[PDB]
Design a protein around this ligand. Sequence first.
Ligand SMILES: OC[C@H]1O[C@@H](S[C@@H]2O[C@H](CO)[C@H](O)[C@H](O)[C@H]2O)[C@H](O)[C@@H](O)[C@H]1O
Length: 417
Amino acid sequence: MYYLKNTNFWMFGLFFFFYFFIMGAYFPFFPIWLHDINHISKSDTGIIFAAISLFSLLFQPLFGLLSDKLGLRKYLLWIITGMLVMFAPFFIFIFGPLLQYNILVGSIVGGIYLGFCFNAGAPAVEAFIEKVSRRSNFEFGRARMFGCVGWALGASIVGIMFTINNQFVFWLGSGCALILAVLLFFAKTDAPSSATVANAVGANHSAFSLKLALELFRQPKLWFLSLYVIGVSCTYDVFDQQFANFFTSFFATGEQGTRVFGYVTTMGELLNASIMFFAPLIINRIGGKNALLLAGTIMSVRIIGSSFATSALEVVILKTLHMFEVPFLLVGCFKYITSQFEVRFSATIYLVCFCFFKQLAMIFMSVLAGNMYESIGFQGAYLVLGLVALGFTLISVFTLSGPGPLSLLRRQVNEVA
Ligand SMILES: OC[C@H]1O[C@@H](S[C@@H]2O[C@H](CO)[C@H](O)[C@H](O)[C@H]2O)[C@H](O)[C@@H](O)[C@H]1O
């Protein structure tokens, strides 16, 4: 219909679709790539990943602030497709070497740029396309749902095709990407048609600063939210970032190990939907403060649930749990801010609580972990994380902010209205 007939919807609705392919392959492929293909150790991964964060810390913000000065100008988005496109050449020829010839520290730092095109770029493409939705009429609401397919599909084809010829996967990741990427730029949207002239008129913006900041640190709830996020995402994320290779110990063969993974991730998002569809009700019904906990608990159990694991089928069950925590954390982390936080603070919150304060820890924990793995084995270290994990989730229960602060209904009218 009008949301399926128009130029831009189709065009970008695709752009979404083919982002995930490349992301798809990229993410899982990565750990596995390193292993089977780059005989990578923990020290190396640990840093590889961790490092990545640094640029997920120092690259993305400047990159989102540039999104405004740019307004709805495609300039930067191209700077994305550009670097994405040499995905195959870059990876095969750059990391491989810097790494394989025996020179790790540089292959990481120096590789976490075409590599940045998938952390910031996400909120990137997720953003721009969003402003284009306000210009045409149909919400990124159905654009992400359309683009998410590519994620499902790719992953599957990833495992399969991967082991058969990883050299290949990149080819089709970066190929369909580029070709279609550029294909989708020649057809765009430039000027208004009743949708206001100035870029500062339709999407509007938000702001942050020292006082805002200086005020947040004054608050105690930041301290107690951060602990949560920081403690628990750091932990959990580090875990999931190298959890794969472990999953891959459990199979008849490496070739089939990999496969299952693609299946899972893929079969996952279909669980993602089912959940989130209820997420809001569930949450509201429940409560921010709770949403998170339940989320963190799960995670804990998904970790501790790995030091006591032996079967491959038993790992299947442990992954799944990933998708149980997604919705709830996103949703909760989101509605808990809005619920115990003055709206003028969101932007600052993310910036300070999730961009300068999350990403930071990972750079450290990751390495800690990597090391713990090499020097103590997967499951062994886990008791450390998962424990710490649950230990921090527990404290949050007994210490996060009131499920119903000193005026829940009044502000719960604030979220509704
Ligand atoms: O990274 C691709 C996936 O991103 C998440 S949202 C994203 O998740 C990472 C962990 O991978 C961090 O928590 C970030 O802060 C967060 O923004 C989506 O939900 C998935 O479907 C993938 O698109």
